[PDB]
Amino acid sequence: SDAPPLTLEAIKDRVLYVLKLYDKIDPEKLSVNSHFMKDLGLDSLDQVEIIMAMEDEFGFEIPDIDAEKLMCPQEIVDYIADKKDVYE
Amino acid sequence: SGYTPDEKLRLQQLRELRRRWLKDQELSPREPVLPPRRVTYRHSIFAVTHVLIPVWIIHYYLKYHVTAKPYTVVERKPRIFPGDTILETGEVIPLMKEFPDQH
Amino acid sequence: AFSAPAAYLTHQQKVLRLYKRALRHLESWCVHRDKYRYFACLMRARFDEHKNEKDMVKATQLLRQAEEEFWYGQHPQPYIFPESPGGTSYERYECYKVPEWCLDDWHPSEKAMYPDYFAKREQWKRLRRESWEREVKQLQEETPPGGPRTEALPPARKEGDLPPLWWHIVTRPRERPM
Amino acid sequence: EHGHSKMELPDYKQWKIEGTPLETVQEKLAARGLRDPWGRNEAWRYSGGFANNVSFVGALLKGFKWGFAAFVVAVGAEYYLESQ
Amino acid sequence: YLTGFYSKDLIIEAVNMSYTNAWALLMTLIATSLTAAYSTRIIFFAFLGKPRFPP
Amino acid sequence: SFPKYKPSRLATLPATLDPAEYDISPETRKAQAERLAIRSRLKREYLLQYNDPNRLGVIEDPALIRWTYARSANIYPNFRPTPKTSLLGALFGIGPLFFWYYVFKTDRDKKEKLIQEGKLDQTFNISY
Amino acid sequence: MLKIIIPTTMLLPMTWMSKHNMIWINATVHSLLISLISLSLLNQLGENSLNFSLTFFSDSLSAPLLVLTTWLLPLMLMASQSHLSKETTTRKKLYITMLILLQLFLIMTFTATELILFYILFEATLVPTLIIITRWGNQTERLNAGLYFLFYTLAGSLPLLVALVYIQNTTGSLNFLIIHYWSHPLSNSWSNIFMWLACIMAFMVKMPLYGLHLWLPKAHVEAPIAGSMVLAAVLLKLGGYGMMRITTILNPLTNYMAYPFLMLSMWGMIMTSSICLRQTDLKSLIAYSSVSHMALVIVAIMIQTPWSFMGATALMIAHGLTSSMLFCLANTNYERVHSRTMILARGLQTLLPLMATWWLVASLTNLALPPSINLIGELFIITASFSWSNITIILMGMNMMITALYSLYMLITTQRGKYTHHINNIKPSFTRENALMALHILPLLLLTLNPKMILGPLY
Amino acid sequence: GGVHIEPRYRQFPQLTRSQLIQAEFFSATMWFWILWRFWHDSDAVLGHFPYPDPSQWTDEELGILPDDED
Amino acid sequence: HTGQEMIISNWHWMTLQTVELSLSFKMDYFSVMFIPVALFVTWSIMEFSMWYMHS
Amino acid sequence: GAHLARRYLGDASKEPDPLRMPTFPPDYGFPERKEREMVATQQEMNDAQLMLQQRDYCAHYLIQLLKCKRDSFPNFLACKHEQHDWDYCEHLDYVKRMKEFERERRLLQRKKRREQREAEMARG
Numbered sequence A: 001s002d003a004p005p006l007t008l009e010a011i012k013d014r015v016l017y018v019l020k021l022y023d024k025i026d027p028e029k030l031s032v033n034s035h036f037m038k039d040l041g042l043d044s045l046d047q048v049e050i051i052m053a054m055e056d057e058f059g060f061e062i063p064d065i066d067a068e069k070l071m072c073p074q075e076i077v078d079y080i081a082d083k084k085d086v087y088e
Numbered sequence B: 001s002g003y004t005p006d007e008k009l010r011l012q013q014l015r016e017l018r019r020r021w022l023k024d025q026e027l028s029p030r031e032p033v034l035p036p037r038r039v040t041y042r043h044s045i046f047a048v049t050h051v052l053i054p055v056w057i058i059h060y061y062l063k064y065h066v067t068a069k070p071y072t073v074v075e076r077k078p079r080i081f082p083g084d085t086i087l088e089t090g091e092v093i094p095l096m097k098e099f100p101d102q103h
Numbered sequence C: 001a002f003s004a005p006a007a008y009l010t011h012q013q014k015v016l017r018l019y020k021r022a023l024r025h026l027e028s029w030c031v032h033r034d035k036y037r038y039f040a041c042l043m044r045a046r047f048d049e050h051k052n053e054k055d056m057v058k059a060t061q062l063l064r065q066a067e068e069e070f071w072y073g074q075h076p077q078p079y080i081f082p083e084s085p086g087g088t089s090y091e092r093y094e095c096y097k098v099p100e101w102c103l104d105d106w107h108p109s110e111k112a113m114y115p116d117y118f119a120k121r122e123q124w125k126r127l128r129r130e131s132w133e134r135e136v137k138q139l140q141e142e143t144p145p146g147g148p149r150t151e152a153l154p155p156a157r158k159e160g161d162l163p164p165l166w167w168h169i170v171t172r173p174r175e176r177p178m
Numbered sequence D: 001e002h003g004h005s006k007m008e009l010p011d012y013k014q015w016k017i018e019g020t021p022l023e024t025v026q027e028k029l030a031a032r033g034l035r036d037p038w039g040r041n042e043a044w045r046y047s048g049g050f051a052n053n054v055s056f057v058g059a060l061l062k063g064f065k066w067g068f069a070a071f072v073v074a075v076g077a078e079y080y081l082e083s084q
Numbered sequence E: 001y002l003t004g005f006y007s008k009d010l011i012i013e014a015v016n017m018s019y020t021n022a023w024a025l026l027m028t029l030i031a032t033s034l035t036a037a038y039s040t041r042i043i044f045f046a047f048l049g050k051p052r053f054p055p
Numbered sequence F: 001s002f003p004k005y006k007p008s009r010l011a012t013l014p015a016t017l018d019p020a021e022y023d024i025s026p027e028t029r030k031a032q033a034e035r036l037a038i039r040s041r042l043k044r045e046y047l048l049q050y051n052d053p054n055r056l057g058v059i060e061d062p063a064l065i066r067w068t069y070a071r072s073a074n075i076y077p078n079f080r081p082t083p084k085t086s087l088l089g090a091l092f093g094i095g096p097l098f099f100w101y102y103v104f105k106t107d108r109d110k111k112e113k114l115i116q117e118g119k120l121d122q123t124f125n126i127s128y
Numbered sequence G: 001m002l003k004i005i006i007p008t009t010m011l012l013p014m015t016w017m018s019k020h021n022m023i024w025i026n027a028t029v030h031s032l033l034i035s036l037i038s039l040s041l042l043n044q045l046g047e048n049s050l051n052f053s054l055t056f057f058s059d060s061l062s063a064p065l066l067v068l069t070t071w072l073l074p075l076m077l078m079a080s081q082s083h084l085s086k087e088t089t090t091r092k093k094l095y096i097t098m099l100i101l102l103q104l105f106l107i108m109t110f111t112a113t114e115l116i117l118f119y120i121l122f123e124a125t126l127v128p129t130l131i132i133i134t135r136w137g138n139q140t141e142r143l144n145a146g147l148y149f150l151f152y153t154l155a156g157s158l159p160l161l162v163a164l165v166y167i168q169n170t171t172g173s174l175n176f177l178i179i180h181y182w183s184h185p186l187s188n189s190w191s192n193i194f195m196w197l198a199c200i201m202a203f204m205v206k207m208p209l210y211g212l213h214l215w216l217p218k219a220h221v222e223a224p225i226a227g228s229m230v231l232a233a234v235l236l237k238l239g240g241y242g243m244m245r246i247t248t249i250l251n252p253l254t255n256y257m258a259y260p261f262l263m264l265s266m267w268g269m270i271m272t273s274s275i276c277l278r279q280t281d282l283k284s285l286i287a288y289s290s291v292s293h294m295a296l297v298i299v300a301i302m303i304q305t306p307w308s309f310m311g312a313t314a315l316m317i318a319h320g321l322t323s324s325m326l327f328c329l330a331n332t333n334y335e336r337v338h339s340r341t342m343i344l345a346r347g348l349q350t351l352l353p354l355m356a357t358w359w360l361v362a363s364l365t366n367l368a369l370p371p372s373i374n375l376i377g378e379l380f381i382i383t384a385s386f387s388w389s390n391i392t393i394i395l396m397g398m399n400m401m402i403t404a405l406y407s408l409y410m411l412i413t414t415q416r417g418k419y420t421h422h423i424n425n426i427k428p429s430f431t432r433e434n435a436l437m438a439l440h441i442l443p444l445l446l447l448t449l450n451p452k453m454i455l456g457p458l459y
Numbered sequence H: 001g002g003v004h005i006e007p008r009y010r011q012f013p014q015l016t017r018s019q020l021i022q023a024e025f026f027s028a029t030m031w032f033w034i035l036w037r038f039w040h041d042s043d044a045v046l047g048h049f050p051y052p053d054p055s056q057w058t059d060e061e062l063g064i065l066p067d068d069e070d
Numbered sequence I: 001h002t003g004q005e006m007i008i009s010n011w012h013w014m015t016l017q018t019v020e021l022s023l024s025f026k027m028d029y030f031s032v033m034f035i036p037v038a039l040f041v042t043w044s045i046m047e048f049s050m051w052y053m054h055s
Numbered sequence J: 001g002a003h004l005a006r007r008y009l010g011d012a013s014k015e016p017d018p019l020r021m022p023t024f025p026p027d028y029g030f031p032e033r034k035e036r037e038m039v040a041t042q043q044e045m046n047d048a049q050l051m052l053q054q055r056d057y058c059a060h061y062l063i064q065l066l067k068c069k070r071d072s073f074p075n076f077l078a079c080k081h082e083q084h085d086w087d088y089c090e091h092l093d094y095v096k097r098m099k100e101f102e103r104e105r106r107l108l109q110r111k112k113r114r115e116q117r118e119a120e121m122a123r124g
């Protein structure tokens, strides 16, 4: 396998990397605690597209009932860490 | 849509407890303790205790026990061609009748 | 898996799920990235043209021919992530997950190794022993009469309290125990 | 000994649609009047060493040149040695 | 002049010149054509295009 | 227009193509609420019985015991002899026996007749 | 033979004067010692028999069954040691007394040079079994099971007594040697047909034949562990042994009186093999498997060819050992689970690996895997039935496939998969259970080296 | 057993010279073998013995009489 | 080199009247040729598995 | 293949079937009727124990090939002249079989022509 033990800061960096390449949102305004519907004015379909992008980038797929209620990068990071059992 | 405040708080507390439990799963340097107690060369010994000894045992078994009984080991008779000589008799098989050879 | 479900799915949830499935199967059909992006943008365009419809009878009339069209062109062999419920490695490691309570049956000679781990284990067991007594009362006083209506559990409200029914969620074996 | 070296992710501003076949997608979406928000996200698949691709036939003859040179050398050596 | 040649070429040659069923002949020929086709599919889809694996 | 998906016994109708949840009425929502309510009640009971540190046994499942009792020990007391049951019993318990008897009797009669005529070529049939 | 019967009798005073905390040790040790003594009987000769005296004789058909009977008792004691922990001393001694009486009756039955003595002990073997089933049984259906087991057997075996006394009145002797030497053909008459039915039905009910097997699932499910093993291993072989002993005087009537029973068995093997697939219980599944195997043995005996008899004896011994092992494993699972349901406990291989190995070996042996004696008997019967008629191969192959299917279903449902979450009393397997499984399985893999010891007199 | 290779995250992975030269050598070996065998053994593919034409065979050696003798 | 063929019947398992079952090995062309191929493939597969299944 | 297409699309009786051939006496063509020669006797071919299907008119070259392969064993490609000779002899045998097929075809052609001419003369 030789898979490195991905950590919380690595997950956050990857999440922000994926988000900053989504040109619908400006990289400067976004923050780890920024919202999606209100702080960035993104559509529901747009949020689904972000969720699918993180799905493709991380190699594991999020169930719909849990994907439809993720609205901040911080809670996305927390969900991924809980899925992958990350200590720190 | 989205997390309700109760859901957020419960998930946060569960995450904290889960991370504490996972961190507690780590093993310290002295955590694994084993009590000790006792009562070319590698290939050289390997070919002796794994190849040579089975050859000896099986050769003995076939030569002096299996072949003792009749018909246990039966060998297909070797092919005889024109011109060969037989060890047991010494007679020579006659050759062919010189078929016409072109191309 | 984590979140408790609702009694029903709203129209918005159905539309979002159909959108996700359609995009996934379109990606499966269009192997390459540029083709996938082009046709995903086209599908988004054809998907948002009825975004602002007001009446619900016509919206429910839609999303039916949409589902039929999806079922007709669903790529009978879609792409499934390896850890998904259809993937190649769905339950591969489910044979390595040994429950925590098994450690209670270990021989004392086996427990002689890893002493610190078992000390922390006793601490966790004591914590659970007190927390359960608090949680049963908290849940008893918090639930409405006639039984719960949804399977959502409340968090901890006091200072020393812990969330009700936490032991078997916190002590999951691992994602890949071995 | 495991893979612990504190890998650092590249800068996000490096990935551009320029020099990739995503221009055709962007242009044909703009002709009908839309844009692809995720265009840059996959630019890395066409940017680095992955930029150059090899055709199927060229893939099949992976070592044709070296093999042909060795074959010619061997044939010449056999010709000059057997003629003796 | 590869390992598969010394077997498959003789298989096809012997099959072509025996008092056998004709439908089996046609099926075998189409089968070897499809063998070449799916070998091409494997190579093209796994070694030629642009990368598609996670980052 | 697209070809319709016709469901069968071994290929059921998908939930998305089903029309029951598109004709929504308040009583349907009430029914879904009651279903979720009873399911959550059962789940809460199971979880209360499941996380108890004092419990050191197997959680008895009334549903499993009821299913086993219905499958095994409740068949005869609810059985009544009816034309359908009687016909099915007679057929499935008598027909195969007589079918196989007829087949084997015919085969053995043919073999014995060939033996009597002597045209069977039983050479080397030493073991029997 | 008295060198075997006398120590078995002395086991009773030995047990009754033992200390309160040492009955199991003494019983096990002396039962094992008795088994060693019984090993001497195995050296049969190609001639008639080992005619010990006017009352007891031993053949190469009786020798394997006698050795298995003497070997089973220590295993029964080790199996019963578990659930009798909270039992008073007198009741434990009574249990051991019942087991010893059962062994003594079986030992006296299997030789029994005279047919009336054979019948007397053959019915005497019914009282200790009924007491064991109806007294030390857990479920409330043990009473109905005991009634079924008693009456199904007795109704079939009562006309046998009349047939035997009639034969003695006409023939003049019931000694098996005289019966074999002075045998005369049975004419085709209604009286002779009913004599055939009376002499056959008593053994066919106990085997059991398909259609009269209703008592077996009840008796096997409701009985304790020791009763289950003694039923599946030895008590089922009484019918087949009696049938192979008594078919010497029913010729040539059998040549056409075997058709109903042959058809019933060749269809009931398929029916019970299919039944095993859809089963919610483990002990019931094993009982139906035993019914299928005994139906195959019935077919073999009714064919009446040397290969049929050899295969029948081999299958008898192999099925006895395999069914005893399977019942042992099911009991070990039930003791921890306390439910006796196949799908209630799952994924036990992750928690108990060695018991998973024992499960795999037992299932493979039941699956008739070569070169185990299970497949030796199976294949001999298959070839004999093929010689009887070329169409039997269809039924036999269908039975083989279904047997493999339900054996691996039993293995997979209980061993593979994800463990059940709400069970946390699966303690590590004791040394007693592992030793029990090892002592069950090792004789099978040892007998596969010397098949001639279990191939019967027609070897 | 090997060397330490670290992940790249959207860049081309590190390639050691050993694997490149080894793959090139083995591909060259295969092609050289094919060419050498084709040079030495051409009849294994093209055939070695001509296929006779049955129409060109005269009636003299086929035992045909000019429709009058028999 | 020679064209050696051989059958070895070492252990006599059991005799059933006129039939004899013994542990007999046939070492004709097929067996003597398929032993090395299978052993070679198994050796390569085991060496590959020492890396594939290290975890 | 063309012969199969001709047989299954034209007239079946026009040209033969492989199963029933030959349908004409060997002496119909020419009266000298030379005999095929065999240079390997029963006994030496039996000792070489080639195969039942390999005991054909080209057996002597096969025996020489076997002798050459057995003698120069380590150099597995030492002897190829006799391999080519055996291939040539098998090619000649196939040529003779083709000759037989075409001879039967033309004989049947002339037989059909003779029958048609006789029928026309009788009708005329």
Ligand SMILES: CCCCCCCCCCCCCCCCC[C@@H](O)O[C@H](CO[C@H](O)CCCCCCCCCCCCCCC)COP(=O)(O)OCC[N+](C)(C)C
Pocket: G003, G036, G037, G038, G039, G040, G041
């Ligand atoms: C290197 C050697 C390898 C082979 C070793 C083989 C050892 C075999 C031991 C097992 C023997 C099995 C028991 C056999 C019993 C049947 C025979 C027995 O009934 O014979 C009796 C005789 O039995 C012996 O006297 C006693 C043997 C009993 C003990 C066997 C040895 C092992 C016993 C182990 C017991 C526990 C040991 C201590 C544990 C703490 C009566 O004989 P009898 O009918 O008059 O003979 C008449 C013919 N005569 C006149 C020629 C004699």
Ligand SMILES: CCCCCCCCCCCCCCCCC[C@@H](O)O[C@H](CO[C@H](O)CCCCCCCCCCCCCCC)COP(=O)(O)OCC[N+](C)(C)C
Pocket: G188, G189, G190, G193, G210, G211, G212, G260, G261
């Ligand atoms: C249910 C679970 C299984 C239980 C056990 C099942 C086995 C019992 C079945 C009995 C076996 C066969 C019985 C009779 C066999 C003789 C052959 C006879 O049946 O065939 C014809 C006989 O014809 C008629 O069958 C006459 C008998 C008819 C009356 C018998 C009852 C038939 C149906 C009853 C079935 C009930 C079975 C279960 C009872 C509880 C031939 O006519 P014929 O050649 O001239 O006479 C031959 C006899 N001779 C030569 C001595 C003169």
Ligand SMILES: CCCCCCCC/C=C\CCCCCCCC(=O)O[C@H](COC(=O)CCCCCCC/C=C/CCCCCCCC)COP(=O)(O)OCCN
Pocket: G152, G155, G156, G159, G162, G163, G166, G191, G192, G194, G195, G196, G197, G198, G201, G205, G212
């Ligand atoms: C699990 C339940 C099984 C029940 C089994 C019951 C059926 C057993 C078969 C019949 C038993 C009775 C047979 C009688 C005992 C044999 C004695 C004998 O053979 O003597 C005959 C006598 O034969 C008889 O008397 C038979 C009469 C039968 C009366 C009782 C009938 C019982 C039921 C009959 C049908 C059952 C058959 C199938 C049963 C299948 C199982 C349910 C000779 O008469 P002689 O006087 O010597 O004449 C010579 C001068 N000519």
Ligand SMILES: CCCCCCCCCCCC(=O)SCCNC(=O)CCNC(=O)[C@H](O)C(C)(C)COP(=O)(O)O
Pocket: A043, A044, A045, A046, C011, C012, C015, C022, C025, C026, C029, C046, C047, C048, C050, C051, C052, C053, C059, C060, C062, C063, C066, C067, C069, C070, C073, C074
């Ligand atoms: C290869 C497979 C092809 C499959 C093709 C599938 C069919 C494609 C065409 C589908 C047709 C439709 O759009 S069916 C149209 C269904 N009806 C409506 O959309 C009315 C109002 N829509 C909403 O309110 C949603 O929430 C929305 C605003 C979209 C998002 O809201 P968010 O603000 O919360 O993101």
